[PDB]
């Protein structure tokens with residue numbers, strides 16, 4: 271076989287071996303500076319868990335010394351270990367996203383709660399948010415409470431604000447597997463005498479979440495997302511392995527009542543990205559075995575569709591997103607009954623392509639993620655006549671963007687001038703596999719050679735992470751590197 275096929279084979283063996291007998295690919299999240307700093311602040315204020323606070327302190331100092339994060343997270347750590355405005359302007363430097371205004375308020379209020387800057391001089395309504403992802407309501411309310419107390423106006427807080435924080439007082443792992451939301455909520459709730467009876471027991475569980483490096487992860491893991499993407503990659507191999515069936519079973523039995531999927535076990539909030547990967551995987555590996563789950567997932571997506579033809583991440587009425595719209599278009603194209611919705615989705619994608627051929631950054635911090643989603647929809651959804659031409663021209667500009675920005679080593683980074691990483695390159699390979707056939711020395715050929723060269727002796731890949739949340743803050747689920755490279759190699763061979 272070719273070097274590429276040999277690389278694909280070794281990687282597939284590794285991914286298959288990582289899937290457990292429960293059908294799941296474990297996908298823990300690494301410690302993160304932001305949540306470690308908030309856990310340290312919370313435990314310090316409550317004079318609790320001295321051993322955990324010492325490990326968190328050591329984790330923060332080591333990480334700042336050796337692998338400092340973005341400037342906002344560095345400022346948060348320095349505030350707890352101990353200008354903020356310049357760190358926020360830099361951490362939000364050119365953050366081109368519809369959530370920018372909320373993020374400025376959120377991040378500044380976090381820094382102010384930790385004593386590093388003044389609280390935003392905004393009307394309290396600035397913290398109001400429309401229902402979206404379940405935990406985001408809690409984060410905003412926690413920050414409102416912290417601001418009201420921090421400015422000396424605790425009477426401002428209303429019973430409806432406290433009520434939003436009650437899930438943070440439940441025992442066990444964080445509600446919706448989100449440690450950031452629980453920590454912010456607990457930092458607020460410790461100001462409330464009538465909630466303090468429940469604080470002691472939750473602090474014990476929080477302290478118990480420390481990872482071996484002494485830090486706190488953003489989330490418990492991403493095993494649904496990771497298992498679905500890995501199952502899809504395996505189902506695109508010439509001869510998919512037997513384990514795709516228990517993987518499909520493990521995902522289907524975790525579907526939410528609305529028919530969608532969250533990112534990890536126990537996440538009740540469904541989202542379009544998780545659901546599209548599950549749907550794409552089930553369509554290939556178990557379309558009859560899990561016919562009802564497939565239909566429920568399709569119904570989930572259709573119920574979220576926005577009037578402009580695009581799809582949001584979590585809730586109808588929130589802004590459509592390009593990558594979510596392209597993912598849903600592709601996931602729904604398998605049913606000839608949804609031709610109209612699919613075509614309106616692909617037209618949305620074409621309308622929002624930028625003058626340079628790119629699309630958007632959102633849940634990924636590289637440009638190649640949305641390019642790969644868009645190109646799959648533009649080239650996979652059936653189309654003829656003028657609409658074929660329109661879609662072909664759009665896909666050409668996206669693939670041209672990739673060729674124009676390819677690094678000398680054959681890979682791509684998070685932005686045009688960043689060093690290459692395997693995940694950003696994997697997304698680009700998925701897209702390029704829908705262009706002309708590979709030729710010696712061409713962009714796809716060179717990208718595949720980059721991936722061949724980056725394979726570790728143990729068969730896997732190590733990569734800078736690309737996932738963000740809250741956007742644009744990166745978090746690291748290392749299992750995704752193998753999975754997305756395999757997805758790329760399965761598409762390209």
Ligand SMILES: CC(C)=CCC/C(C)=C/CC/C(C)=C/COP(=O)(O)OP(=O)(O)O
Pocket residue numbers: 369403406448489495533541543544583633737738739740741742
């Ligand atoms: C990769 C993927 C599954 C994409 C869809 C979004 C999603 C469910 C992400 C998984 C990780 C996570 C808990 C993000 C929360 O972002 P946030 O709610 O803090 O973000 P925001 O404040 O920027 O809206």
Ligand SMILES: [Mg+2]
Pocket residue numbers: 406409740
């Ligand atoms: Mg958030």
Ligand SMILES: [Mg+2]
Pocket residue numbers: 405409448450451739740
């Ligand atoms: Mg969050």
